[PDB]
Backbone:
DNA sequence: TGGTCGGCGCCCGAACAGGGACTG
DNA sequence: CAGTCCCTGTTCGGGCGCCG
């Protein structure tokens, strides 16, 4: 009985027919070796680590890095080869807690388990596979071989085992204290009660005793008796919260890696700072080779970055969640497929903010993008608060009614009201349901040669108007669009158009207001200027009317 | 202390690994209460992360129920167990169930909790319960008994089920009983009152073997939706062009359709609104066509090996059309639904109701659930569908975006 | 020095799916 | 009647941000 047993362990098999890691250690610099040897020798006295005779034929590299904002060192094991051969787990960490989720509490304590991984026993049979060899100041001294007796850092089963073990320990305390709120994230514990401050500290120490029984130690150094608490990168005050300050690089010359940090910082910032825009800054990253390559900022990404910094200038804060009051999400259109939103309960006191900028589809409109933002906000809300906010949307009720009733896809927005904050979202044009009496009828078609990439686009009309245009470096699809563009260019304010192109009719019937294709944009530009457009489809090669005549012209 | 039938996955197939999706506060509260009682009764027990399999869980309320029902999305597990339930213990399908004037559906899922489950199989029934705002990590469970919604539960319990049924069946030979997953379909030709009474008899019969259900179907009322051609006193060029396009598409289904005499009417290059008188040849060609569309397609018959496919079209004004088939253009049934719940206010609720109704008809007619081609965007459906779901099974679906060039199914 | 693990978010590009139209 | 080519949309893994 050389090593004692503490808390219930988790059986951990290897992947079938596979064996423990063997790989030689790193040429570690002696400066790092000083820190590692001191800490590692200490482990054996506790029982966290054990010596092994060469009967253990396993070697895995080892390294270390300083704990941020501390003198202490972190002991990591590059278990990349052991992970590959270790059984798969199911992660129990399903997301990140958000402060906007928190309800107001009279007394808040944040406490941190010490050596959290090293306090949880590894599986007894699995302990052998940990084996690694320590290094010395010279290559003369061999160094001892060690096997972990507890969860180690760098393995792939460590987080899930710790989180599940921690939850099992906490569950009896939370059953005895139903009215205490414990947010458990890894080893960080947030404890909140409406108990008066003296009574609350009684429960806090009583909880510390409960964790102590299983060998979990909460040092005073990481204890947080007094606000503002530091938790999950936020600063928690009694009635408000905010992100811990974010430093944005000042570089005069920007590389590729530079922009990534910038973008990723601004995404973190946009959860509370309203109106952050990353569109033009991200435009700089598309289709680039080297992470090291230097890139100059366009006057678009520069202007953007300028106002982005100025938004950060003023301090902003979020509030907490009041289950009694409604949740409200308001969305604004920011241009160039960019949308921002605010979730609040009392007007002008935001719980959180955010942006939806994703460009989805080659052809789209503002109504679809607004629907996407509503869905993204809805799921985000269900995670944080477990309910859907009421929506305030910059789209007239009749606009939305016209879109969803006529669209061929099922589409829906949950309970919402119109807010008259411009720019309003609208449909730029409407296709007629019936043919227009007294409007010229344009029969349009186009064809192209797969090999030469040459083609023709043209129309014929009931009044006798005709056109054929030669085109170079095109496709059948592109000439079918071109034919429609020609009819729109050459027609009056009301026009009937008959095509046999399912491709073109499908794009145009969805009422797009923006397109990646410049040709579609020009078609859109023309559709907006018309008073009435009726588009109709007929099957090709059926000997129909004008369609047969124009097909002969463009085929030539 | 009952023997546990061993179960295995289809060869070469690992267990389900499907992330749990976010749940509303009401559903999480319902699940926590349901799972606490199930753990106390030994039906489920908590498990660690060492189990690498997960299946999504959520809660529903059946029509008019008001009481939460736990529902596990076992579709991934069921496909992985697919050979076992159909090949080994599968239930024969009563061709007569669709003919009965009244069919009631009963939730017998609770019975499955009696039997225990193969210890080696329980690792695959794992499900995680999420927490609001991720206050806690996921609380994982696994099943110790036969789970509701798994396709092995009705098969393993079929031996037990028939013995319980057998006294009732002999007492009423005419009545037809079919079992699909958690459901018992009970079809009689009796008058309404006698039928409801006989269901109570089968309820007590289930009660003394260790559940009230009120969902009534009338498969004889069920009708189909023929392709229909407009009747017009006068026809414009646009009308004839629409008609020719519809008939040409229809000719992929009924090969006897002819458009020649109707095409003759659109020889020129004419304005769309110009009125065109019909010739006698076109009137007769249109007449012969309308007759053909009343007829059935030649050689369309159900094939038990092949999967059912369901397609749905949104026609507007609360109207939806569907086709069930196995081969393209060989439609086993075609229908229309109108004035469903959420009509004129909610497409997603209406589409959800439609999927449920279509699946129910397929269970009654063929004992299968179809794979749905849904006219909706993937993200729109996934956000909302669980909010409107009132059934204990879940069909397979995929998402399509077909803009409608011609209104073949509706008018 | 360069180097580990799990979770979530964004934006990217590449690889893959599949539906029509047209070519033999 | 296959086999392409267009064109579109999805998925998945990469980089970064953030949390232990
Ligand atoms: N860079 C990293 N790599 C691998 N695992 C990491 C990690 N950073 C954190 N973890 C894992 C390892 C365990 C946990 C780390 O949390 P603490 O920073 O608080 O270190 P703790 O062990 O608790 O010692 P204490 O500070 O209390 O004295 O998350
Ligand atoms: O809606 C698609 C979503 O399906 C998931 C998650 O539940 O899979 C379930 O639905 C699929 C489509 O019917 C089934 O094929 C699958 O077996 C079932 O688990 C997703 O992984 C998928 O993205
Ligand atoms: Mg700690
Ligand atoms: Mg043509």
Residues:
């Amino acid at each position: 009985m050389v090593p004692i047993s503490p808390i219930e362990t988790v059986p951990v098999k290897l992947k079938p027919g596979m064996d423990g890691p063997k790989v030689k250690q790193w040429p570690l610099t002696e400066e790092k070796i000083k820190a590692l040897v001191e800490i590692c020798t200490e482990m054996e006295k506790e029982g966290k680590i054990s010596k092994i005779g060469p009967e253990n034929p396993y070697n895995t590299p080892v390294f270390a890095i300083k704990k941020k904002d501390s003198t202490k060192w972190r002991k990591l094991v590059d278990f990349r080869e052991l992970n590959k051969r270790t059984q798969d787990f199911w992660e129990v960490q399903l997301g990140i807690p958000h402060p906007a989720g928190l309800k107001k509490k009279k007394s808040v304590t944040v406490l941190d388990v010490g050596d959290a991984y090293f306090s949880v026993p590894l599986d007894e049979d699995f302990r052998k596979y940990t084996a690694f060899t320590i290094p010395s100041i010279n290559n003369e001294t061999p160094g001892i071989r060690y096997q972990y007796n507890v969860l180690p850092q760098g393995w792939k089963g460590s987080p899930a085992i710790f989180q599940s073990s921690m939850t099992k320990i906490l569950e009896p305390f939370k059953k005895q204290n139903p009215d205490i709120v414990i947010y458990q994230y890894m080893d960080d514990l947030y404890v909140g009660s409406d108990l008066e401050i003296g009574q609350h500290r009684t429960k806090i120490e009583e909880l510390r005793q409960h964790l102590l029984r299983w060998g979990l130690t909460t040092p005073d150094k990481k204890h947080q008796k007094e606000p503002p608490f530091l938790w999950m990168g936020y600063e928690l005050h009694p009635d408000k919260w905010t992100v811990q300050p974010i430093v944005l690089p000042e570089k005069d010359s920007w590389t590729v890696n530079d922009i990534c940090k910038l973008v990723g910082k601004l995404n973190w910032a946009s959860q509370i700072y309203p109106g952050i825009k990353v569109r033009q800054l991200s435009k700089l990253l598309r289709g680039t080779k080297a992470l090291t390559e230097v890139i100059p900022l366009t006057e678009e990404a520069e202007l953007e970055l300028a106002e982005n910094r100025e938004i950060l200038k003023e301090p902003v804060h979020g509030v907490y969640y009041d289950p009694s009051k409604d949740l409200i999400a308001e969305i604004q259109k920011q241009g160039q497929g960019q949308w921002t939103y605010q979730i609040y309960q009392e007007p002008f006191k935001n719980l959180k903010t955010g942006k939806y900028a994703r460009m989805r589809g080659a052809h789209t409109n503002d109504v679809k993008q607004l629907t996407e933002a509503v869905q993204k906000i809805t799921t985000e809300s269900i995670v944080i608060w477990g309910k859907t906010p009421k929506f305030k949307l910059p789209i007239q009720k009749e606009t939305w009614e016209t879109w969803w009733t006529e669209y061929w896809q099922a589409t829906w927005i949950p309970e919402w009201e119109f807010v008259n904050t411009p720019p309003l979202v609208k449909l730029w044009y409407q296709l007629e349901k019936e043919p227009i009496v007294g409007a010229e009828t344009f029969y349009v078609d186009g064809a192209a040669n797969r090999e030469t990439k040459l083609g023709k686009a043209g129309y014929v009309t009931n009044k006798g108007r005709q056109k054929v245009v030669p085109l170079t470096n095109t496709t059948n699809q592109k000439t079918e669009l071109q034919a429609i563009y020609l009819a729109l260019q050459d027609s009056g304010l009301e026009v009937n158009i008959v095509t046999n192109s399912q491709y073109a009719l499908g794009i145009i019937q969805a009422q797009p207001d923006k397109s990646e294709s410049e040709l579609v944009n020009q078609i859109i530009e023309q559709l907006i200027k018309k008073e009435k457009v009726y588009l109709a489809w007929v099957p090709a090669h059926k000997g129909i009317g004008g369609n047969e005549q124009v097909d002969k012209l463009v085929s030539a | 202390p009952i023997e546990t039938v061993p179960v295995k996955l289809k060869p070469g197939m690992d267990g389900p690994k499907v992330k749990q999706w976010p749940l509303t506060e009401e559903k999480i509260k319902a699940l926590v209460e349901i799972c606490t009682e199930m753990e106390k009764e030994g039906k489920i027990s908590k498990i660690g992360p060492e189990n690498p399999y997960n299946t999504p869980v959520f809660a529903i309320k059946k029509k008019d129920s008001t009481k939460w029902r736990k529902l596990v999305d076992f579709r991934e597990l069921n496909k992985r167990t697919q050979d076992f339930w159909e090949v080994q213990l599968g239930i024969p399908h009563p061709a007569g169930l669709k003919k009965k004037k009244s069919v009631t559906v009963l939730d017998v899922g609770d019975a499955y909790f009696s039997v225990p489950l193969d210890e080696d199989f329980r690792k695959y029934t794992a499900f995680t319960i999420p927490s609001i705002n991720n206050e806690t990590p996921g609380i994982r469970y696994q099943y110790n008994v036969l789970p509701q919604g798994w396709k092995g539960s009705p098969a393993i319990f079929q031996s037990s089920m028939t013995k319980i049924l057998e006294p009732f069946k002999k007492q009423n030979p005419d009545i037809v009983i079919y079992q699909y997953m958690d459901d018992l379909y009970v079809g009689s030709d009796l008058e309404i009152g006698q039928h409801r009474t006989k269901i109570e008899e089968l309820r007590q019969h289930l009660l003394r073997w260790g559940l009230w259900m009120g969902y009534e179907l009338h498969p004889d009322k069920w009708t189909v939706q023929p392709i229909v051609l407009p009747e017009k006193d006068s026809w414009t060029v646009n009308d004839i062009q629409k008609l020719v396009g519809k008939l040409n598409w229809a000719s992929q289904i009924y090969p006897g359709i002819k458009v020649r005499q109707l095409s003759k009417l659109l020889r020129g290059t004419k304005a769309l609104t110009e009125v065109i008188p019909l010739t006698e040849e076109a009137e007769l060609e249109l007449a012969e066509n309308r007759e053909i569309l009343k007829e059935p397609v030649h050689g369309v018959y159900y094939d038990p090996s092949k999967d059912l496919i369901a397609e749905i079209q949104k026609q507007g004004q609360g109207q939806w059309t569907y086709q069930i088939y196995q081969e393209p253009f060989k439609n086993l049934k075609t229908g229309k639904y109108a004035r469903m719940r959420g009509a004129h206010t909610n497409d997603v609720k209406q589409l959800t109701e439609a999927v449920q109704k279509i699946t129910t008809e397929s269970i009654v007619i063929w004992g299968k659930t179809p794979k749905f081609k849904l006219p909706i965007q993937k993200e729109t459906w996934e956000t909302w569908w669980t909010e409107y779901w009132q059934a204990t099974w879940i069909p397979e679906w995929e998402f399509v975006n077909t803009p409608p060039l011609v209104k073949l199914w509706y008018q």
